[PDB]
């Protein structure tokens, strides 16, 4: 029934049912792993972390997953602080001068200086190089996040750390379709950097405002939309000169300088 409720996008109803199942079979690690993922979809971060902790104690073979997603949940708090203009994220790879105005714009937004923040973003965008490439086989002249607070920047979690990766530093990105429920929140990825470095990563798959301001459909990534505030919720969306591609429909992204 919980799977059915989830399919229908009835998150609260699903949560009710699943917690009753766990209460009935408290030693069942499979149910608690389901519950952690559902809690994460709903943005109940501390309760999600609680379930992970219990899973690690019930099944020591799940401990690597537990470490990975416990730190991923920690990163969502860091995410909030970065977009609130209160924290500088880790920057991956070669330094990019135009990242600084992007970050400063977040601070200026926080202080109600939206026009000045807009000016800094316009400058950052102008300075960031248009790098051609392809999404699978489909060419583009440039690519960015539909979120103007990022533009040509990818949010990543690497080794449990929240970071910004300028797309100009990226050679290729590979992802698969989401498979587990937690993949709607953090999509596993392989990244190769232009200067050679390669690493596995998690990609925060929804916009940061989704948990608080989105509806159930948004939290499940079944829509992308912009709030009256001007901020996006729902599934991450990439835009190019030629079209747009939602994250869960991306498989391979290659840049060719």
């Amino acid at each position: 029934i919980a799977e059915e409720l989830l399919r229908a996008g009835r998150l609260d109803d699903a949560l009710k049912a699943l917690q009753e199942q766990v209460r009935s079979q408290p030693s069942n690690a499979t149910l608690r792993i389901f519950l952690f993922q559902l809690l994460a979809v709903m943005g109940q971060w501390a309760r999600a972390q609680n379930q992970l902790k219990v899973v690690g104690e019930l099944d020591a073979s799940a401990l690597p997953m537990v470490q990975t997603y416990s730190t991923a949940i920690d990163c969502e708090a860091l995410r909030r602080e970065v977009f609130a203009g209160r924290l500088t994220p880790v920057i991956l790879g070669q330094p990019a001068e135009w990242i600084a105005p992007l970050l400063q714009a977040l601070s200026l937004d926080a202080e109600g200086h939206g026009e000045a923040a807009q000016a800094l973003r316009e400058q950052a965008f102008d300075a960031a190089p248009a790098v051609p490439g392809r999404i699978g086989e489909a060419p583009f002249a440039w690519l960015a996040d539909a979120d103007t607070r990022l533009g040509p920047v990818l949010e990543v979690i690497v080794n449990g750390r929240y970071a910004w990766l300028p797309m100009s530093n990226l050679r290729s990105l590979k992802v698969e379709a989401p498979s587990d429920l937690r993949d709607l929140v953090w999509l596993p990825a392989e990244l190769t950097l232009a200067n050679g470095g390669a690493t596995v990563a998690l990609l925060p798959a929804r916009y940061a405002e989704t948990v608080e301001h989105g509806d159930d459909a948004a939290r499940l990534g079944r829509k992308t939309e912009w709030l009256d505030s001007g901020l996006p919720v729902g599934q991450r969306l990439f835009v190019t000169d030629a079209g747009e591609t939602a994250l869960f429909d991306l498989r391979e992204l290659d840049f060719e300088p």
Binding site: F125, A128, A144, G151, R222, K223, T224, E225, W226, E244
Partner: peptide
């Protein structure tokens, strides 16, 4: 417009 989504209508996914 470089890096800009021209459309901000709600998207179905």
């Amino acid at each position: 417009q470089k890096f800009i989504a021209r459309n901000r209508a709600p998207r179905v996914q």
